Amino acid sequence: AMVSMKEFIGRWKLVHSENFEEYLKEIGVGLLIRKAASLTSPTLEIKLDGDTWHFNQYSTFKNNKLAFKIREKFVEIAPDERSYNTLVTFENGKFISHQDKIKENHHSSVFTTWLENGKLLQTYQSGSVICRREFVKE
């Protein structure tokens, strides 16, 4: 719980990934898209504008910009082009996003972003699948 929110601010480059394509398959992404999305090494930019956070992911395949306020539910248009009811909290040093499905045939996910020894780590969880990603400061 020691890590402060401000330590996340900056630009981060993907250096390792595990189970990302499998995570995308689990949440219903088609083969061509999940293959292409998993081949990239995106840059994640985290910035704070007043009380609005921005987690923007940039890559050759798609740019994904997410804006939110902590503790405030919002409708997220996720990169899979489906809409979700998303809620991001900051708990014990970590950003936790609950991306809740709206349509019953969709899938919900939990995203956790945290810092360890200068690196930024993420997990994306849905159903039986957890994806793990690691980033280094740009």
Author numbering: 0 to 137
Extract from the study:
Folick et al. further identified a Lipid Binding Protein 8 (LBP-8) that mediates the retrograde signaling between lysosomal lipid hydrolysis and nuclear transcription. Interestingly, LBP-8 itself is also sufficient to prolong lifespan through activating NHR-49 and NHR-808. Here, we have expanded our knowledge of the FABP family by reporting the first structure of a C. elegans FABP, LBP-8, and exploring its ligand specificity.
The crystal structure includes all 137 amino acids of wild type LBP-8, 92 waters, and two sulfate anions. LBP-8 adopts a typical lipocalin fold, present in all FABPs, consisting of a N-terminal alpha helix-turn-helix motif lid (αA- αB) and a twisted beta barrel containing ten antiparallel strands (βA-βJ). The interior cavity is lined with polar and hydrophobic residues generating a solvent accessible surface area of 825 Å2 and volume of 1170 Å3. A network of eleven waters are present in the putative lipid binding pocket and anchored via hydrogen bonds with amino acids glutamine 56 and arginine 132. The interior cavity of LBP-8 is lined with hydrophobic residues (F19, F60, L65, F67, F73, F94, F110, T112, and F134), which can stabilize fatty acyl tails of fatty acids via hydrophobic interactions. The absence of these conserved amino acids and having large pocket volume suggest that fatty acids can bind variably, possibly explaining why there was such diversity in our lipid MS data and disordered electron density within the interior of the crystal structure.
